Amino acid sequence: EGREDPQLLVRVRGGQLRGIRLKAPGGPVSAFLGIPFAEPPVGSRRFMPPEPKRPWSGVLDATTFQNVCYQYVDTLYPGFEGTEMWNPNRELSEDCLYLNVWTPYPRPASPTPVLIWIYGGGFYSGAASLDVYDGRFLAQVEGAVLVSMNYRVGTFGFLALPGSREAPGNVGLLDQRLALQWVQENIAAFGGDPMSVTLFGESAGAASVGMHILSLPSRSLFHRAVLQSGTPNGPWATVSAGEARRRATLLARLVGCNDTELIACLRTRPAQDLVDHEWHVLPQESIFRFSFVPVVDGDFLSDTPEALINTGDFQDLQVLVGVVKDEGSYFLVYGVPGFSKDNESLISRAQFLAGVRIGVPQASDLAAEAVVLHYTDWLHPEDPTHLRDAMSAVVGDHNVVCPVAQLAGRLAAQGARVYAYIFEHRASTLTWPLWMGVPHGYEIEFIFGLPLDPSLNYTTEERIFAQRLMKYWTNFARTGDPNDPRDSKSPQWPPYTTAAQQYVSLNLKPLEVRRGLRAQTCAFWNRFLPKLLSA
Template structure:
């Protein structure tokens, strides 16, 4: 709409202008269980429905120092109003520098400063006077469990929120050794803490999304590649099942050969990484203490050295069958019917379907339905 051409100016107009606004800054303040957060209005190109964004809301205490490799603790309540108007730090990760400046590579590299203080989530809410009981979609990024960030341009949730009139949530979770280094028998590095980060974010959504106008009974989790495998793990994990309603797995399932390792293999990789960075000898506690004394980049630089030379399409630090988060191997749990019985959408694309979803009949045994021919 073209602005009206005013040909005169009057103090009376100064009085009228503020009253013409339909939403004030106070409308973007939401009370959560942890404290108040302030969002901001986001425009969506080619869409008439604007969106209110809440970027970088903390859901976990920074997993730094002695908390490295351990399950995160929920964010403690804060005073005042938290300004949620910018994307958070990306979790520390491998950065692909093989083709500097090439958009097809750079689009997946972190576009924010990297930090171990990275447990934050983002929310996009369709802008209306009072949204109420809207469906919620929670995105879990992929990246082989070694890379990824909720701040990537391709994960901007404003478009989905505006077009489909749903609340969109995305979260960061620890990846690489920081999220998946595992030594069985020790609470200092039990493994799967990246999955527990995701679960903590899902619990935060259950506790708080109603305050944003969302319906905690209509939460769909969805992810691609390692994110799809993560969605599958939450379908299998007893502690995660109550925290969502439906699931979408895109180009990744938990029984992919690259998506998990045994505790024995996880220990071998952890020990190999320790040796590579100069943490030799001692018991598990001493090994973990030594690894905590290394800079994040020192660990990242050696991550790929832990893979067996025969490994093909494998990633260094991934989820482990720990008997708790993942009680048994995915195949065994599916065969015994031990998973969340709910509506599931599964998809793959092009050349990835054989590598990533070849185990589809196993994951959904008895539930398979061929998709319609859309050609």
């Protein structure tokens, strides 16, 4: 050193880092990008739990985002912003275990509450370097320390031969835990308070957060949690050991392959060969199902998430959970016949019946009959607009809204302080059609405060709204309470309770309190539907 910025040189347990001074709209922030937290999970290390990064010599350059974990790249709508924003924005590589830190400039003297972001992407995609996960605004406006990590997705992160030494499963979840441990040891070097760590994530990110709650060794690593449109419970976020074993063995066959000899062969295959056959191992034609997800191993997860939340002690737990207005709409264009971004997707009754089989791929004929019965409007059973919207509701309720209601109730009844929301504002900038409403993942840009960037063409009300949400989230991280103790007449956000079931709406209007999270409909999915599976 000698001639460089004093605020950009930090030491962590593994060596020295040089960061970068970035511009946020209201002033500068410090960013430390692509910090390695694990040994590169390559060669013989593929499918294995991550090993902590061995110390380095000299000053590591941390001024750019690192590799994105090897993954499927989406091709459904070539050129289209609505899909491309989720695509990898850095080189794909198995050498991808790096994390990022944003702090105020200059760094705070008094220790500051830490927010850790875990991205979604169905456990097959995602990256902490996407524009919608830009930590600069929360760092600058709210004085937060913000951390995000890459974790292995797809086969690399989740292929499992349960029981074996060489592919135990859930290793993507372990990548996340390693980063949480890295925050505990090192975040005070950046002015962060390791005793005030909040996890937040959206859709497999949310489900990820939920699994850290349910897994004891992760519980000591954080204090509060946010789950946006995602739960560890529900139909897509985990598979049984048997089901994981089956998908893993099948995928091996597809690429040319005693567990040891199997995995050893898999390790000789190029990454791209595994991505190429990833989608061919699902049991049924489906949407909102992903090939390689967390497995119930009797380790990371001691029992099913359903079981762990029924019988769990959550006395010391503060949790914020919610959903977007249209949870189901996004995935309909990925393989329900009739749906497209390019038209209004008015469908027939036949397409709806077919849609229900694809969207609830585990239903018997009788259970699918029940779904269809409940979601048909019997005044207008053949109306294309209702059928289109009902198909969206079926997917959203089954996969997100009802799992979230189930989780909120079981947490509240067992000690937890729970706050609940529904996000209802469709961004002025959205590129998806109007019929998709507010699709999942389109709250994220507001929480991270992108509208504060004048170059992005958000409206002024959207700028004020973004600030409102950043406040809710950072208040919650600080205190376990989204409300401001100061401002006391602007309507309060009540905790969600089994008794009253209150949650708030999030839009341009001030907070409105509501009761019952799709209560009638969720009784159908969460209480009745399991009984119908036992016939």
